[PDB]
Design an enzyme around this catalytic site. Structure first.
Site, mmCIF file in Angstrom:
data_model
loop_
_atom_site.group_PDB
_atom_site.id
_atom_site.type_symbol
_atom_site.label_atom_id
_atom_site.label_comp_id
_atom_site.label_asym_id
_atom_site.label_seq_id
_atom_site.Cartn_x
_atom_site.Cartn_y
_atom_site.Cartn_z
ATOM 1 N N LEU A 44 0.803 -1.218 0.000
ATOM 2 C CA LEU A 44 0.000 0.000 0.000
ATOM 3 C C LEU A 44 0.838 1.270 0.000
ATOM 4 C CD1 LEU A 44 -2.746 -1.091 2.556
ATOM 5 C CD2 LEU A 44 -2.782 -1.209 0.036
ATOM 6 N N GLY A 45 2.049 1.227 0.539
ATOM 7 C CA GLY A 45 2.904 2.399 0.515
ATOM 8 C C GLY A 45 4.177 2.146 1.287
ATOM 9 N N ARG A 46 5.056 3.141 1.250
ATOM 10 C CA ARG A 46 6.306 3.082 1.992
ATOM 11 C C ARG A 46 6.653 4.482 2.470
ATOM 12 N NH1 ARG A 46 10.740 1.717 -2.809
ATOM 13 N NH2 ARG A 46 10.007 3.264 -4.338
ATOM 14 N N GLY A 47 7.204 4.563 3.677
ATOM 15 C CA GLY A 47 7.637 5.824 4.244
ATOM 16 C C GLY A 47 9.032 5.712 4.820
ATOM 17 N N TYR A 49 9.761 5.377 7.885
ATOM 18 C CA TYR A 49 9.768 4.522 9.061
ATOM 19 C C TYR A 49 9.124 3.159 8.856
ATOM 20 C CZ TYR A 49 11.063 8.841 11.458
ATOM 21 O OH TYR A 49 11.697 9.997 11.848
ATOM 22 N N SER A 50 8.498 2.899 7.710
ATOM 23 C CA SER A 50 7.783 1.639 7.560
ATOM 24 C C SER A 50 7.444 1.395 6.099
ATOM 25 C CB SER A 50 6.501 1.618 8.392
ATOM 26 O OG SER A 50 5.533 2.504 7.857
ATOM 27 N N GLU A 51 7.096 0.146 5.810
ATOM 28 C CA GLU A 51 6.410 -0.234 4.586
ATOM 29 C C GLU A 51 5.067 -0.827 4.976
ATOM 30 O OE1 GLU A 51 9.550 -0.647 1.213
ATOM 31 O OE2 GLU A 51 9.216 -2.611 2.145
ATOM 32 N N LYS A 67 2.091 -3.024 8.984
ATOM 33 C CA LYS A 67 3.111 -1.988 8.894
ATOM 34 C C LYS A 67 4.419 -2.609 9.366
ATOM 35 C CE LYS A 67 3.395 1.864 11.756
ATOM 36 N NZ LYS A 67 3.134 3.277 12.168
ATOM 37 N N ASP A 155 1.494 14.527 15.280
ATOM 38 C CA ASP A 155 1.686 14.396 13.834
ATOM 39 C C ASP A 155 0.335 14.446 13.129
ATOM 40 O OD1 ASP A 155 3.359 14.217 11.532
ATOM 41 O OD2 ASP A 155 3.346 12.035 11.549
HETATM 42 O O1 RXE Z 1 -4.290 8.537 1.935
HETATM 43 C C1 RXE Z 1 -4.146 8.966 3.029
HETATM 44 C C2 RXE Z 1 -5.162 9.951 3.600
HETATM 45 C C3 RXE Z 1 -5.227 11.272 2.836
HETATM 46 C C4 RXE Z 1 -6.451 12.116 3.180
HETATM 47 O O2 RXE Z 1 -6.706 13.078 2.535
HETATM 48 N N1 RXE Z 1 -7.289 11.717 4.299
HETATM 49 C C5 RXE Z 1 -8.467 12.486 4.668
HETATM 50 C C6 RXE Z 1 -8.001 13.810 5.268
HETATM 51 C C7 RXE Z 1 -9.140 14.657 5.836
HETATM 52 C C8 RXE Z 1 -9.032 15.139 7.132
HETATM 53 C C9 RXE Z 1 -10.044 15.913 7.676
HETATM 54 C C10 RXE Z 1 -11.161 16.203 6.914
HETATM 55 CL CL1 RXE Z 1 -12.479 17.201 7.587
HETATM 56 C C11 RXE Z 1 -11.270 15.722 5.619
HETATM 57 CL CL2 RXE Z 1 -12.732 16.125 4.680
HETATM 58 C C12 RXE Z 1 -10.258 14.946 5.069
HETATM 59 N N2 RXE Z 1 -2.981 8.572 3.795
HETATM 60 C C13 RXE Z 1 -2.044 7.655 3.176
HETATM 61 C C14 RXE Z 1 -1.781 6.446 4.068
HETATM 62 C C15 RXE Z 1 -0.695 5.562 3.457
HETATM 63 C C16 RXE Z 1 -1.108 4.097 3.520
HETATM 64 N N3 RXE Z 1 -1.242 3.696 4.913
HETATM 65 C C17 RXE Z 1 -0.315 3.889 5.845
HETATM 66 N N4 RXE Z 1 -0.739 3.417 7.008
HETATM 67 C C18 RXE Z 1 -1.987 2.907 6.813
HETATM 68 C C19 RXE Z 1 -2.894 2.286 7.694
HETATM 69 BR BR1 RXE Z 1 -2.401 2.047 9.560
HETATM 70 C C20 RXE Z 1 -4.128 1.850 7.239
HETATM 71 BR BR2 RXE Z 1 -5.340 0.995 8.504
HETATM 72 C C21 RXE Z 1 -4.495 2.017 5.898
HETATM 73 BR BR3 RXE Z 1 -6.254 1.375 5.325
HETATM 74 C C22 RXE Z 1 -3.598 2.633 5.006
HETATM 75 BR BR4 RXE Z 1 -4.115 2.863 3.133
HETATM 76 C C23 RXE Z 1 -2.323 3.083 5.491
#
Ligand code: RXE
Ligand code: 42J
Length: 332
Positions: A44-47, A49-51, A67, A155
């Site tokens: 799903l992604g990589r950062g 600190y984690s994949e 994670k 964060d």
């Molecule tokens: O895409 C996003 C979110 C982006 C986004 O705009 N949000 C909504 C933001 C928002 C906040 C307030 C309001 Cl008011 C409104 Cl309107 C909208 N972030 C990437 C995560 C990377 C993948 N990733 C990492 N860790 C994860 C875990 Br843990 C889980 Br569980 C799951 Br599922 C996933 Br996928 C995970």
């Protein structure tokens, strides 16, 4: 003479009243599951600190998120685990389901409940005034809970907010930077993403508290209602404070500096300049006016204050008029 001390306005002593095992995460013993219960499905992604992977628990056919942590100090893994366990079951807090050891890298892996994330490219295109109020209120539930439990997230930003829009379901994730609040403790100011750093972080004031999360929430709210991401778009940590000062003005900044006797890094002298406090109307235009209201601007103004002590608490924020129709709808 050094900086004036500060204490959180609320939830000041909640950790003091706990057994030390609640917050003394260095002494936490990790309870390990069986990595063989899971099969990884896709990445799903990589950062840094984690994949992150989608996975399946093959003992019960449940979808989960895994994670796999990159090498980090053992006490920081213990910190994130202890905080996730302490907050588990709280409103809109991501649920840690399991902790296993990756056979490949021999590193720990956190197993979370799956959230069917909503494609946010579409979400932002059709985002309504009510959607923003509703999801902000859901985030405030998570923040009031974790603060009441003695924990700062540190964060808060859109990337760490999962939304399953079909089910109006929201989860606050990535607690790897979160810490326990203790009165008088000085914290690391190199936390949070640049655009969401509070002024206390940017002027190196270390005795901060839960109100840090409320600044970040105000930054997120401004980007949503004005459709301007990021709202404070600094080039670096120094320029980030200049961007804030061009909006909030330099008078309240220097009043804040003087109040806490903060020694300002001399780099700021020749870049902060002199700026008036701007009216929020200058960010309103034909493409975002449907998301902006007097209530939204009043609420936003009470979150984005230099003085962390004068920002709304999470519970005060929930009582603001901006949320009146959300609150009565949830009473049903
Ligand atoms: O895409 C996003 C979110 C982006 C986004 O705009 N949000 C909504 C933001 C928002 C906040 C307030 C309001 Cl008011 C409104 Cl309107 C909208 N972030 C990437 C995560 C990377 C993948 N990733 C990492 N860790 C994860 C875990 Br843990 C889980 Br569980 C799951 Br599922 C996933 Br996928 C995970
Ligand atoms: N048990 C083999 C698949 C696998 C590999 C690594 C991890 Cl971290 C997990 Cl949960 C599952």
């Amino acid at each position: 003479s050094g900086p004036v001390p500060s204490r959180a306005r609320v939830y000041t002593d909640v950790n003091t009243h706990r057994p030390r095992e609640y917050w003394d995460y260095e002494s936490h013993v990790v309870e390990w599951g069986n990595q063989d219960d899971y099969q990884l499905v896709r990445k799903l992604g990589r950062g840094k600190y984690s994949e992150v992977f989608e996975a399946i628990n093959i003992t019960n056919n449940e979808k989960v998120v895994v994670k796999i942590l990159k090498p980090v100090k053992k006490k920081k893994i213990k910190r994130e685990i202890k905080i996730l366990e302490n907050l588990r079951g709280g409103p809109n807090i991501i649920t840690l389901a399991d902790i296993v050891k990756d056979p490949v890298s021999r590193t720990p892996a956190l197993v979370f409940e799956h959230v069917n994330n909503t494609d946010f490219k579409q979400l932002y295109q059709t985002l309504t005034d009510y959607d923003i109020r509703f999801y902000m209120y859901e985030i405030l539930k998570a923040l009031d809970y974790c603060h009441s439990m003695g924990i700062m997230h540190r964060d808060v930003k859109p990337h760490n907010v999962m939304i399953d829009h079909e089910h109006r379901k929201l989860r606050l994730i990535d607690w790897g930077l979160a810490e326990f609040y203790h009165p008088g403790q000085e914290y690391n100011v190199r936390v949070a993403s640049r655009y969401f750093k509070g002024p206390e972080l940017l002027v190196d004031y270390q005795m901060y508290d839960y109100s840090l999360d409320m600044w970040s929430l105000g930054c997120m709210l401004a980007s949503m209602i004005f459709r301007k991401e990021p709202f404070f778009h600094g080039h670096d940590n120094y320029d980030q404070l200049v961007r804030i000062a061009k909006v909030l003005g330099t008078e309240d900044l220097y009043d804040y500096i003087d109040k806490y006797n903060i020694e300002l890094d001399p780099r700021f002298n020749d870049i902060l300049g002199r700026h008036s406090r701007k009216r929020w109307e200058r960010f309103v235009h034909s493409e975002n006016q449907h998301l902006v209201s007097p209530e939204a601007l009043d609420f936003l103004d009470k979150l984005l204050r230099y003085d962390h002590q004068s920002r709304l608490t999470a519970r005060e924020a929930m009582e603001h008029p901006y949320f009146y129709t959300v609150v009565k709808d949830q009473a049903r």
